[PDB]
């Protein structure tokens, strides 16, 4: 049911600019956002850690919080000015959502925020005030050969994208590229606010959910360099997709799991959308280039997991069912199909994934 | 077992060329010159010359046009002109046949040996090659994913630590290899050049040649060649990959030419010049021994691979292996694959790594 | 003389678009910027090439147009709306500055323009309307190894800079980094709209000349590519400066020369500037990492040299000379002086530039 | 000339490591651990040993804490144990003086020859050597600037062709080097591993080590090597580069360490193992010969050079170079050089390229 536009004005949003994900085992996280991915701290205690990319100025890209159970707990993106949260909250409250407003903040290094159930059932937060920290940017005695520079975007699973995308578009997203088939069904759309291809995206699925959060590397080797020290410290199977070229966003990427199965892209080199004409880009879900421009196969962990989300009460918002056609089924499993040359019927897969591989049982 | 011969073993510089037999010319030519950026020294209506980037030889490739894809040689250069009738009385006293012509083979080859290995390959061994244009500063012809050297050849054989002793007595030096714990080998790696590998064996029916190999200058032209084929849309020829490999620690990528003939792009393995360097070996269900980052081997991987031919140009027979199948193994229905040793988390039981089975 | 800010709204800059270039022959600059470089053409005929970048999607980047005297023709910045056109054309009214409006375009491509002589002297277009073309983001079947990805910013000389600076925020351009001394001098200042480092920029020097037009890579290796094949060519001194690690942006960079002595720079990796509140960076102009932060020198022809820009009846416009401390005199001339640390004597530089020269 | 002697010369592997003497180790320590990366082998009050990241024998590097900073030993690893006697052998009929220690002079290397060279360098020649750890897939180590092996040598020594015979009679097979019309010649590189060099010759004042070489995997580990020196504020301690060479191809950086002594990193020469190899010789005054993009060659880079140690550790005394200079005849005051042979444009007369 569609999401009616409200009469008040819209949050001027500047971009993603952190998550809050609640964590179960502090430390084993810290080993894996500090130690493996090189993420820069903050502040920390025994309750959370407060990180920050290489090239950040606001206080933190990603907070880990201590908690019972792995969920997101909130997606924040930063507003233009201080009136913007006042806007917010009005537009929110137009919608009829939940929301709730701290002057001083919900986590250390921001000032005035609201946080808001959205109607995908998604935690937002949107704040202008936070504590700017040093940049890092020029400080190559600290880099890293597998550098996390910035945070890129959020990904979120819900179960109808059309509904979520006009919904976001009238919040002054505007949609990139997108996933259809031919016969109406929408399966992904990417949308953005800052002049690359996201600051967020839609995942058909049961949802609330979080699919990821991405960071970007300044180049490919850097994200070869993660994957390479994950098989140094024989944690590859948490490498759980990738590397690989993108179909859509045209980047290179790499999906990997924290010990909360939380997942995280590492992302580089998608182009410039900040023209406000700036050409969409459909791609049909049958297309085995569109999500690995290669031709490899998306691993079906990849459509079926992702994380909960939380409620302002810090409850878990319950999975509504996609009913829409799912995206998995109808590419790799069992009445699925994909080709790769459109009406060729060489390079083409009729019930089973690409490169010689099928769904595990 | 391959006797050690009597007559000293000719003095093997490295892998030199491959003459791959291809079926359809300008088709293999599209492949070769106009997606690969291969650079030609030679071409006529039957047959194509090629070389990377960097070298100075007259070429790292032939193909030539014949009615069944296959492979007609692989070359070697040796050190001298004394050593091709080295290689020959070597070969002849392992009772192999063997042809010699004075004026080569192919063209920009002069004194050449071809001979019928013990395996069933077609080895050449030469010295004398006309040599060309080094192309190593050419940066106005260089390519987003420019070849730079052939690097090695890789050989399907079905009884490796056989092949492997004879490789030995030839001067071949063993790199890394793959057993399980209970005395099969499934693959060997071996040298002559001081890099990981001149030629290597993978454990399955043979003679079959599995790839050829080239290198790049860095990871980034390994990426170009599947973008590029991403926009050529012709993914669905890139077969495996890219990846770093656990044995040899290089950056890859493997491609299938228009008569499925496996091409690998390669970078960044290690120096093993030193005579004591030291040997690698990896337990076959180590799941970062092929794909570095656990990324799992697709089966035609391990299936499928070139036909060989003899000297007289007919298809070589194969013979089955008996050991057990490095697929099977590991990622069929009984086969296994673990990320840390004597760890059940991260293991892979009847199938492949990621969530996937064996289509 | 302070430029004063128009109670009309000003319009809003999306970021650089395109550069009209004159040029005298315009074979020898198509085989530069086509051969060499590896633009893409949208439209050519006798008199003009339109170029554009790997990802670009508007007609073009890059106009070249045939002319007796090579110069700068027009900067032009695309605008968000059709009505910020109108905007655009009330504000440089305003300023009391000559102004051309076009509903159907200056050059092939670009629909309703206005191009103004501004208060520097320097020749701006805004535009909305604009043809699009098949964006070749993934066309790596033309991929160059030393592709050119984006038309990054513009660099304008100029000879007051304070002054230059005031009038850019006032139009919506927000400084990210610029360079001063102890004794209230400015040499140079970055501002942007687009959310990266710079769409425009300001060198002090006379002026009004065009420093250079740049354009991005997606890598360094990209940059070295373009080094190693001009080599090839054996046209290596065709590169002036770089290539470097800037200090000023952080981006990796390189200065090369086209055949009419226009500047291009390659670019890449910069950050990201769109919060409001961005932190500015200023730098000492006696700080040697300031311009390349591995402390090469920087030539004194990157100083000295920049391109001729037209007014609207296509004359070149008069030189206005700086008065302002030169940076070139302050940090390598006879009486010059830089430092690596600040404070320490090692290291620094006295009366020349550094490494040896 | 040096006569080759009747003995045969020792089977001579690659370049192994070299033993530089600094004068406050902890200084030093910094720059190769801290900036540079480098893997500690061994370390006590007295030395540091290190080694590159693929690396098994059991160092590249050892410093050792002396009252003059200086190199004592180039060392070269020999084929086989009994290439140390040959080693012997060879450089008694040469009449140099040598040093046999059939224990080494170093940690982690056994039996060990050093000598006095012909041309005043202590080379040391060993086979044995303690194995340690290889680290070339220790990614959870790797650096953003990675050194990964050492690469060569370069020497500074006055008569560039007598230098270059003593070397081919040892084995050494020149790849490339710069002459002109005239005859003189400035420079020669040289190799057994199969690379452009093991070491190679530089035209000067000597002997003295001109630097060490180690090589990265690519092209950005060099540029992450000069963006930390700016981090750091050290900025000054990059001498030259980051460039293309004409000579060998490959990308390169020159840095200078506490004492001065001069490091080069290096990646992507091209093989040359064949013995056909062809040889490619430049003329000195192209300006593409040593930076591929004409950058200029800095004066310091010409006419500084480390001191080098006699086997009672004493400095070695100098020898004029009484040959053409090249500084002089390519940047000094009557010097040129081109960019294209024959073209006045892009040529530069008393005067370096670019503007200075
Ligand atoms: O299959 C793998 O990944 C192991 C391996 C290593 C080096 C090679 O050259 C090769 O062809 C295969
Ligand atoms: O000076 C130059 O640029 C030529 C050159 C080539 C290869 C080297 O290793 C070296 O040290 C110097
Ligand atoms: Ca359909
Ligand atoms: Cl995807
Ligand atoms: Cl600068
Ligand atoms: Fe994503
Ligand atoms: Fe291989
Ligand atoms: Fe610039
Ligand atoms: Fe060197």
Same mark, same amino acid.
């Given at each position: 049911?569609?999401?009616?536009?409200?009469?008040?004005?819209?949050?001027?949003?500047?971009?993603?600019?952190?998550?809050?994900?609640?964590?179960?085992?502090?430390?084993?996280?810290?080993?894996?956002?500090?130690?493996?991915?090189?993420?820069?701290?903050?502040?920390?205690?025994?309750?959370?850690?407060?990180?920050?990319?290489?090239?950040?100025?606001?206080?933190?890209?990603?907070?880990?919080?201590?908690?019972?159970?792995?969920?997101?707990?909130?997606?924040?993106?930063?507003?233009?000015?201080?009136?913007?949260?006042?806007?917010?909250?009005?537009?929110?409250?137009?919608?009829?959502?939940?929301?709730?407003?701290?002057?001083?903040?919900?986590?250390?290094?921001?000032?005035?925020?609201?946080?808001?159930?959205?109607?995908?059932?998604?935690?937002?937060?949107?704040?202008?005030?936070?504590?700017?920290? +040093? $940049?890092?940017?020029? !400080?190559?005695?600290?880099?890293? #050969?597998?550098? /996390?520079?910035? &945070? *890129?975007?959020? %990904?979120?699973?819900?179960?109808?994208?059309?509904?979520?995308?006009?919904?976001?578009?009238?919040?002054?997203?505007?949609?990139?590229?997108?996933?259809?088939?031919?016969?109406?069904?929408?399966?992904?759309?990417?949308?953005?606010?800052?002049?690359?291809?996201?600051?967020?995206?839609?995942?058909?699925?049961?949802?609330?959910?979080?699919?990821?959060?991405?960071?970007?590397?300044?180049?490919?080797?850097?994200?070869?360099?993660?994957?390479?020290?994950?098989?140094?410290?024989?944690?590859?199977?948490?490498? +759980? $997709?990738?590397?690989? !070229?993108?179909?859509?966003?045209? #980047?290179?990427? /790499?999906?990997? &799991? *924290?010990?909360? %199965?939380?997942?995280?892209?590492?992302?580089?080199?998608?182009?410039?959308?900040?023209?406000?004409?700036?050409?969409?880009?459909?791609?049909?879900?049958?297309?085995?280039?569109?999500?690995?421009?290669?031709?490899?196969?998306?691993?079906?962990?990849?459509?079926?997991?992702?994380?909960?989300?939380?409620?302002?009460?810090?409850?878990?918002?319950?999975?509504?069912?996609?009913?829409?056609?799912?995206?998995?089924?109808?590419?790799?499993?069992?009445?699925?199909?994909?080709?790769?040359?459109?009406?060729?019927?060489?390079?083409?897969?009729?019930?089973?994934?690409?490169?010689?591989?099928?769904?595990?049982?």
């Amino acid at each position: 049911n569609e999401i009616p536009k409200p009469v008040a004005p819209a949050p001027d949003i500047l971009r993603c600019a952190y998550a809050e994900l609640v964590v179960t085992d502090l430390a084993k996280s810290r080993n894996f956002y500090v130690d493996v991915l090189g993420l820069h701290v903050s502040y920390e205690d025994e309750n959370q850690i407060y990180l920050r990319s290489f090239e950040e100025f606001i206080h933190h890209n990603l907070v880990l919080t201590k908690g019972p159970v792995a969920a997101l707990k909130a997606m924040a993106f930063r507003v233009r000015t201080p009136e913007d949260v006042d806007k917010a909250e009005a537009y929110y409250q137009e919608l009829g959502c939940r929301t709730e407003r701290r002057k001083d903040g919900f986590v250390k290094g921001i000032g005035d925020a609201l946080r808001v159930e959205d109607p995908l059932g998604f935690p937002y937060e949107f704040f202008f005030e936070t504590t700017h920290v +040093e $940049r890092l940017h020029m !400080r190559y005695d600290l880099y890293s #050969a597998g550098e /996390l520079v910035r &945070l *890129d975007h959020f %990904n979120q699973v819900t179960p109808d994208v059309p509904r979520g995308r006009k919904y976001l578009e009238d919040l002054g997203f505007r949609v990139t590229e997108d996933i259809q088939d031919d016969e109406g069904t929408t399966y992904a759309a990417w949308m953005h606010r800052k002049g690359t291809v996201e600051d967020t995206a839609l995942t058909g699925g049961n949802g609330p959910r979080l699919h990821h959060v991405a960071f970007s590397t300044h180049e490919k080797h850097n994200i070869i360099q993660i994957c390479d020290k994950m098989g140094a410290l024989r944690i590859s199977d948490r490498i +759980e $997709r990738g590397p690989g !070229r993108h179909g859509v966003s045209n #980047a290179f990427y /790499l999906y990997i &799991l *924290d010990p909360d %199965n939380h997942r995280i892209e590492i992302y580089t080199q998608d182009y410039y959308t900040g023209d406000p004409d700036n050409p969409t880009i459909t791609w049909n879900v049958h297309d085995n280039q569109r999500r690995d421009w290669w031709g490899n196969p998306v691993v079906p962990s990849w459509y079926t997991e992702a994380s909960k989300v939380l409620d302002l009460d810090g409850n878990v918002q319950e999975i509504i069912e996609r009913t829409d056609d799912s995206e998995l089924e109808v590419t790799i499993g069992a009445d699925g199909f994909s080709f790769t040359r459109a009406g060729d019927e060489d390079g083409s897969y009729h019930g089973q994934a690409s490169k010689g591989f099928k769904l595990g049982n």
